[model samples]
Target chain A: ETINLKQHLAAIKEYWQPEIINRHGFQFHLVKLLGDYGWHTHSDKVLFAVEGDMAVDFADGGSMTIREGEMAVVPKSVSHRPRSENGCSLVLIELS
Target chain B: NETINLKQHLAAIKEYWQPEIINRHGFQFHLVKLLGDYGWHTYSDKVLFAVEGDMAVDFADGGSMTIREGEMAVVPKSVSHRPRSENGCSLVLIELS
Candidate 1:
């Protein structure tokens, strides 16, 4: 009788969108990415994996690969782009 | 660097509702295990909840609600709320520092 995430996601009826799943001072966005996510930066952001593979590119020089069952915390103001060709479904968190 | 798993550590906490720092930056993400009952914890910052099981939470000024796995809740700033569980429960939480 509680909110089910699997069901909530199934009802999305769209794709490549970051839908609001929860919030406090923080906002949780659930998205399914297939190809490309351009470079951007947030004060603080964390990517929680649900399915598939994810690769993050930081503008500086390094990059990180976030696999399933893992979370990648991106430092504040670090320009980055997240890409995945095989497709991925994940939760992205941000603070305001 | 890649991602990290907080569940591995959360399961080890054993201390119900006692927040364990999973990751820290300007903001800190914590993992907690809940037992029979847990209530209001007053803090200056807002707290976010990402539950992995069933639980009930209520506030002094507000009311209570049940949140389950795949569900989430937020505890407001300067407000007091309860973090309770029916049996054993686990959750992911974070606060702005």
Candidate 2:
């Protein structure tokens, strides 16, 4: 429910670690990361960009850049990582 | 891949004051353009109201606040608030029911 989520992004001090802005169904894991996107995955996932540019690398094949206001999902149990050189905030939805 | 793009939804908006469903799984995310005062209501605690303009939220509890762009208000679960809006106000409603 936020567009400019700078306040929430700055509230956390580490990468990968998420803050609890919500507990509805799956965790709305609020994360701020830098070091370029990750080779990440999903039991079903949606990376909703809160701000900045994000990129995801798939272990088996390709990469996708998720710019501000865009989203992406890595297929279930797929070995992938999300990394971004640009400082970015995202609601990492881990589907239950 | 997202089932619906927010940009597409923005393009799909006919009336900003009405609620439109964007994406859903276990939770329903709705997009809406808010005008004036929204009748006081309550639903989910995970509900966070983000605004693009100066908006007033008068809660049934002792909660009253004005939120604008870059800020968000998390209305308590089951708590009531008379929700109102400013021009160019769009919001996301995360319904847990």
Candidate 3:
């Protein structure tokens, strides 16, 4: 199946809610972010910014920003919260 | 350690069809530029997301499709397929390690 990132992202109405766009062995998610999100941990997840900018703050007092067409990997079991100042869309890739 | 700019990384690749590993966890994300055509091959399943231009994948079973920018397709494991791009194309590929 062919998946369009922009089409799936346009259908999302909730912030922080990841909408599954497709799945192979991995799950592809279209997530919109705005404001702040709670710190959480899970398996390693890769976040690719589709629009705007996404800021990820870690428990280690470090933070990073992901701009459009940029990507970052959130290591497994790491405490982190992802937030966007002006709102952003991302393509999140993770194990199913 | 820091966010990777896919456009920046892709710019450093001067070769065609040779995928470079950009990052990895359990799976690997690769940056590749495609042009002309490639020989038929098979491997583990992979997800291909076109970043620029357009790409065409022709299967041995007589199936073919074109993937444009912002579009993605999952190539099933062990499927014999050939990839081609008339002008040129860059894409991100997720593959099993």
Q: Tens-digit lDDT track for model 2 on A1-96?
A: 332367777778888788865434445678887885444444556677778787777776777787877655545677877888777788765533
TM-score sort, best first: 3, 1, 2
Weakest ten-residue segment in model 3 chain A by summed lDDT? A20-29
Alpha-carbon runs more than 4 Å astray in model 1: A1-4, A21-24, B44-47
TM-score of 2: 0.68
- State the lDDT of candidate 1 residue by residue for A1-96, as single tens digits: 234456656666655777885555666788887788588866677787677888888887788887876677777887888888687777777776
Provide the TM-score of chain A alone for each candidate, in the order shown.
0.83, 0.77, 0.91
| Residue B22 of model 2, lDDT score | 54
What number of backbone clashes does candidate 1 have, counting pairs of residues 3 or more apart or in separate chains?
A: 1
For candidate 3, write residues B4-48 as lDDT tens digits: 788888999989878888655656788999999868878677888
lDDT of 1 by residue, B1-97 (tens): 4466656666677776687875556667777778787446666354444546677877796777787765656666777777788876688766666
Error of 2 at B14 (Å): 3.8
- Write one digit per residue (lDDT tens) for candidate 2, span B1-97: 5444556665567685688875544456677777776587764554444534556678786767776765544555676677787566666655444
Q: DockQ of every model listed?
A: 0.51, 0.31, 0.67
